Symmetry: D2
Subunit: 114 residues, 4 copies
C-alpha cells in the first residue's frame, strides 16, 4: 500500500520535523500538491533533528513525505493518529538498508498549529 501520503484540510498550516538514525545521509522531501515544498537532509545515528518547518497544505490538502539515501528511495511506513478528536499526527518511518529498524529517517507531521 501507498505510505507517507496524507490528506489534510485545505489551506491549513502544519508542522513537519525530521530525525535521522542511520549511517546513510537522509534526504526528506515534503511534497504539497505533488510539488516539493520542503527538503531536509543530514546524517545522525543519534536522532538529530535534520529539519523542521511550517508549511501550508494549500488548496489540495495533499501532503506526501518521500525519503531517499544516495538517490535510492527508502521503504516507508506511516499512519495517522488523532487524539481527543482534535490533535493530528501523521507519522513516517523509513528503512534505507537491511536491519529493518525503520528509523533511518523519522518524520512527524502535526496539526493544527497556533
Amino acid at each position: 500500500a501507498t505510505q507517507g501520503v496524507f490528506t489534510l484540510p485545505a489551506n491549513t498550516r502544519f508542522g513537519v520535523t525530521a530525525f535521522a538514525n542511520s549511517s546513510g545521509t537522509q534526504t526528506v522531501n515534503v511534497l504539497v500538491n505533488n510539488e516539493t515544498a520542503a527538503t531536509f537532509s543530514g546524517q545522525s545515528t543519534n536522532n538529530a533533528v535534520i529539519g523542521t518547518q511550517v508549511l501550508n497544505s494549500g488548496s489540495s490538502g495533499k501532503v506526501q513525505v518521500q525519503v531517499s539515501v544516495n538517490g535510492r528511495p527508502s521503504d516507508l511506513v506511516s499512519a495517522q493518529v488523532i487524539l481527543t478528536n482534535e490533535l493530528n499526527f501523521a507519522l513516517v518511518g523509513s528503512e534505507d538498508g537491511t536491519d529493518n529498524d525503520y528509523n533511518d529517517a523519522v518524520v512527524v507531521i502535526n496539526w493544527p498549529l497556533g
Copy 2:
C-alpha cells in the same frame, strides 16, 4: 485515565522532542523512573521545537511527560503507536486553556534510535 505515561523497554535510548503552539510559555518535564531527566521551555504559536534530547529509559522503562503553563498543569492526551512491529512513537498533546486544540505543548517520544 492517566495520560502521558509510557512503558518503554528498559535501558533503551529514546528521543524526546517538544513543540509549542500557545500564547502561554510552556514548560515540559520528562521524568524517567519518577525523576526529572529533561526540561524544555519556550513560547511560540508556530510549532517551535523548544527542546529535543536523547535519554535512556532506565531500569523500569517508565517515562512520564508533564506540562505546565505559569505553574498550572495542562490537561494531557496521549497514545503510543507502533509501525511494522518495530518503530515506536509515544505521543502527547496538552491543553493550557479553553479552546481544546490540545497542541499547546506537543511532545513526541521515539524509539529505537541508532
Copy 3:
C-alpha cells in the same frame, strides 16, 4: 480531555462493535448527533461480542460512545488511527472498576464500509 467522541465524514456508513471483559453487565450507547443510534448490553470476561451494527453518521458526522455499568458512567479512553490514508478506526476502552485494564467494554468503530 473528552474521550469517545469522533467526527466522521457526513452521511457515511460505519461499523460499531463492542466487546465485554468485566464481571459486570456493560451498557454501551452509541450516539449520532447526540441522539441514541444503537445500544448494546451484555456480560463477558472473555471478550464476547455484545453488539455489532452498521450505522450512518448522518448529517452531523458526530459519533459518541458512552459506557456505563449499573447506570454509572465508565471512564473512557479513545483515539482514531488511519491506515494508508484510507482506512479509519475509532477505538474506545472503558474502565468500570479499580484495576485500570480499560477493557471492560471495548468499542471499535470502522469506516468506510462496502
Copy 4:
C-alpha cells in the same frame, strides 16, 4: 515493510475479530508461533463479523494475520496502538482489488482480556 505481524507479551490472552467489506469471499488466518490458530471465511459488503475468537499468544508472543481471496493474498496494512499505557489494539486492513479502500477484510486484535 512486513505488515500484519505483531509481537504480544508471551502468554497473553487476546481477541481477534475479522470484518468483511468486499464482493469477494475473505479468508482470514490467524497464526500464533507460525501455526494457524484461527480461521474465518465469509463474504459481506456490510461489515459482517466473519469471525471472532480468543487465543493465547503462547511462549513466543508472535501473532500474524494473513488474508486471502480465492487463493490470492491480499495486500496488508497494519499498526498497533496503545491507550493509557495499557489497552492494546493491533489493526489490520487488506485490499483484494483495485479501489484501495483497504477494508475488504479488516482484522482487529485486542488485549488484555478479562
